[PDB]
Each structure stands twice: as C-alpha cells, then as structure tokens.
Target: GII.10 norovirus P domain in complex with 2'-FL (tablet)
Amino acid sequence: SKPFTLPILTLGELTNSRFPLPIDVLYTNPNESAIVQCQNGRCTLDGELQGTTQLLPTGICAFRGKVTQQVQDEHRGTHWNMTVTNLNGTPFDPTEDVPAPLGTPDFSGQIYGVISQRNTNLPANRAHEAVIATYSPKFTPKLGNIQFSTWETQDVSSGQPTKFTPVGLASVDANSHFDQWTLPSYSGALTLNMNLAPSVAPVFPGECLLFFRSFIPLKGGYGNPAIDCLMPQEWVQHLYQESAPSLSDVALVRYVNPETGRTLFEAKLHRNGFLTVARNSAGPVVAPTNGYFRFDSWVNQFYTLAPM
Amino acid sequence: SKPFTLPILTLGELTNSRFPLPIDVLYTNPNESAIVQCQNGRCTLDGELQGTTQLLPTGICAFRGKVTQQVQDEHRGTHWNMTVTNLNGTPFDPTEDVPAPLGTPDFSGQIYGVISQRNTNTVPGEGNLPANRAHEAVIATYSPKFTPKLGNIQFSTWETQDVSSGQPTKFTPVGLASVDANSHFDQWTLPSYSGALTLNMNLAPSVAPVFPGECLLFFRSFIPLKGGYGNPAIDCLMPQEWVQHLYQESAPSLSDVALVRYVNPETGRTLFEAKLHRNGFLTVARNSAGPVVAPTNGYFRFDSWVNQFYTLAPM
Ligand SMILES: C[C@@H]1O[C@@H](O[C@H]2[C@H](O[C@H]3[C@H](O)[C@@H](O)[C@@H](O)O[C@@H]3CO)O[C@H](CO)[C@H](O)[C@@H]2O)[C@@H](O)[C@H](O)[C@@H]1O
Model:
C-alpha cells in the first residue's frame, strides 16, 4: 500500500495555491468568523483535485478568452466584456461538474493584473493594466463571461486572444469588497454556486486551522493584505502525482528543523486537505523558513495534538 | 540506488522554467547558431541546481529590493535605480558562487512587468497600515545599468513620479515590452550580470547534442508583448516541475544519458524517444525545425539508463 508522503520543500521553497505568490509565513486565526471554503488549493490526501483547483502555478487566478464589448464606466475607467474558455483554450462546458473554469479566483475583491492580446491575423500585440471585480454582477465565469476594467480607454481589441496575468489587488478600502473567505457568485448573484469543495474546520476542541500565508501586492491605497491557503501549490502537485491511499481520516505531521532534527510542533493533516494545530492565539508562527512538514503516522479525530 | 524517475505530467500540466508561462509545445531547431547556455531551469539529473536556478515558479525573472532614486537615462521613459536582494529578502552576497541572485533573467531583452511597493513605515491614522503603489515597468537586461551581480538594476516606467525612494519593491514579470530590432531580444544571449565588459562567472555549462543527427528538444512557451508585432517564444531545457522533482528525489545518475519515451497513455504507445542527458537536457533524432505535433496529454517516461553509443529511433 503506497506510503503517504509530503514533499521535502521548505517554507521558502513553497508557493501559494490561491494566488501566484511565495509562501511568507505559517499563520493561525482561531477567532475567524467566516466559513472557510476556498476553491483553489483544494486536493484530498489521496490526490483528488476539488473546487476550481488545477495544477499550473500560472493558472491560479488566470483567465483566457476574447473581448466582445466595450462599455464606459459611469465615472472613471472602461469596462470590457470577455468570454472565457478553459485555460487550455478549449471551450468551457458549463455542464461539467466544476464551480467555474479551473483557475478562476475564489474570493471577493478587485484583482489587479495585466490583460495582454496577440492577434490571430507577424501578429499585432497590446497589453494594459486591468482590474477584475469578482463581486460584480458581471463576474459570471460559470456562464462563460466576465468583465474587466482598464485605465486605458480604447486600445483593447475585440475578437482576439486575450490573457489575464494576475499581479495583486487594486485596493482593500471599504468600497473594494476584499474578503478572502467570501466566494464569488460564479453564475451571478441570484444563482447558487455548485460543485464546491467542502468547507473546512477543526472538529477537536482547542484546535484551529493552520494556513500558509502570502502577502499580496496592492496597486494603491493603504493596507497589508494577505491570502491564506490550506496547502501550497507544490503539495497539490505532489498529492496528485502520488495518489497514495489515505489509511485514516487524519495524518499526524511534524514540523521539523533538519539542522537539529528537532520537532518544532505537530499538526493534524486532514483527509480533505487541510491542517489543524493546537494553538489558542492568532498570528504568524515564528519558525525557520528551512523547516518543513514530515508525515509521522495515521491517527484519528480523537488524537490530542501537543500544544504549540 | 534510488531509482530515477520523472513526474507524470502532461504538457498541459507543465510550466516554463525560464519565464512564468505554461508550456505550449515541444520544439526543435537543429540549425540554431547560438550557444545554448541558459541559466534558469538548470538542474542535473541527480538534483543539483545550477546557474541562477531556484525552485519557486514565482521567482523566475522576479526581483526584490528597494528603489533608491530616480535616475537619468537616454532612453524613453522615467528611470529608477533599485538595489536587489535575494528573493527571500536576505542581502545578496556577491562572493557566493552564483552568476547573479537566483531567479535573475537569463536572456537579453526588455522584460515587461509590474513594480509594486509596500512601505515600511505605517500610518497610525490608517490603522497602522502602510501605503502602496504599483506601475508597469520595463527592465532592459542588456543595459549597462543591469548589474544584478553587483546588487542593483534599473527599471523604467511610464508613470513619471509615483515610485517611492527607500521603500520595499517587488518586480512581477509579465512578458516583453517589444521585440523590435532596437529592443535586443535574444533568448540565447546572456546578460552581463556585473555590467558591460565584465565576464560572467559560475555559469551552468552550455548544452548540445553529441551524436550526429540529433538536436536539442525544448519545452516552448509563447511570451506576451506590451506592444508591437511579434510572436516571441522562450525555450527551456526542462520544465520547472522537472527541476522541482529532480531536486527532491536526488536519484543517483547511473550513466550519462537516460532513455526516455514520450507516451500517449490512452494507447500506451510510444510516440517518440529521446535522450535525457546528465546535465539536464533532451536530444532527439530529428532533422527539422518547428513544433512537435503530439497530444498535450502525452508525457515522458523513464525507460532505462543507456551509454554513449545508443542510436535513437528517428521521430
Ligand atoms: C496611498 C496612496 O495610494 C495611491 O494613491 C493613488 C490613489 O489610490 C487610491 C486608490 O485608487 C483607491 O482604490 C483606494 O485604495 O485609495 C487609494 C488612496 O488611498 O488613486 C489616485 C487616483 O484616484 C491616484 O492614482 C493616487 O496616486 C498611490 O498611488 C500613492 O503613492 C499612495 O501610496
């Protein structure tokens, strides 16, 4: 029976599965009131991708498609409607059992990046800064179309292959609706999201979720926003490759310093693909960025973790 | 000996190790005249990273540092000097045996992306939070001001004033600014990491076929353009996921060449075979240039270690 394993990449060798960023710190927040139900970076321990999760680091919060219409904003900026395909360029089939095209953003906010185009008919090219408001009524990726806005007023071509490269957030002020745990309405506001990866939570008292946290760039304004993922992208890729059978619902993992061999703390790695620790405080976990998680053994829901 | 393995990823599940792009096609060009000596995506089969190669997909062609001041330059735009650190924020030690900070671009051109800043100082009235800004930027890697091995580079912006001196700065690559003649795009020309007229050091070695009839096989991605005409591409020797896998496994290399087969798993039939060389590159028996037309659900499978006398089946 294929033994379960995690990669031997250190924190400084891991990337976020919910936005294209390095992992900066491990992090807890026991008093979080939101339901944690992100859709990228979702993979079971036996290698089943869930939600909108796909394997490419370049596909996280990316879109591919074509522009079909230009509409000027009531105040400032220009909006462009974009039909979206699968990231591999094949048409998106709304009947497939996914919430949205794989790679679609899984949080409410104004996502800042670059739209680029390379024409079909050597080809002409253009690129501009762009913002995608995932809370907008026009954010309907499950129906095959989204809207982006630009500061550029005219030089975006219709009917030509278009790529969105995410870079960060446009703003986190009150009017920008940034909330990392609020899912977009993938089909628009009056329609239920479907085919979601399940919510995650600790089930044992005194435990809290452990996140891999990355700080996300901002186009302007004040803030130090972060995106927390349940497992880094390299873990998604590893679990998918190995497809090792899960022998219980909960694996015990140890965070180790290899310099010393000492265990710094232990955690539960749950079958659905998330970590819990026994910690009663919020904030970063102070540890070397050369530490890493090692699988110890399968345990069960009733195992008592050593406190952090 | 731990058996050598490759990951089981189709072309559509792989990314480029020289720029943050998906792999689009496999590609050959037997008549290439340049020396192929790229410095990102360099890893031996037993897991030794070489050149400027590092493991993060977000680190490829990225920079981290601080803007110092606005500077004058003959070229169009507004220009800024920035010191560069290691990507993990620690100071870059020029005495380390590397060509430049890991992740530094390994080709001549005008690299287009976004510079972003998050200030160190916070404002009590803003909830004790820092101010931020981001703007499009271009780094000309052929410029005499591109001196990452000395710990500083220059970038240009269309924005004329809203870049802050002394503040932490990140460069996120997106594509190229141009591939016109005056933009000096050449994927096989290395930057001068310490400036004009200095010799680059600590380089990963050049790669080439040894056997007649063989040519290099590349993983090709098409790179976006800010403007102008073109369909530029970046060719890597192995995808970033192979770098990551080889690094993890560190399997001993039992000869100088591994025989690999590109397989369609649906039929289990081999589409073609290739040599995977110890230093981390592929060759095939092909006498044409251009894409390899095969399913993007195909993948390479390790078959066996072979010796210097193996003749590959023509593709
Ligand atoms: C804090 C400063 O941010 C930028 O100022 C620009 C300003 O940014 C505003 C955002 O557009 C808005 O969404 C929200 O986040 O508030 C920001 C200001 O607090 O926008 C105007 C245009 O309306 C200008 O572009 C300002 O420069 C940044 O550019 C500054 O350098 C500051 O960091």
Notes: Residues A 171, 173, 220-222; B 131-133, 162 surround ligand 1 (CB under 6 Å). Chain A has two domains: 2-59+171-308, 60-170.
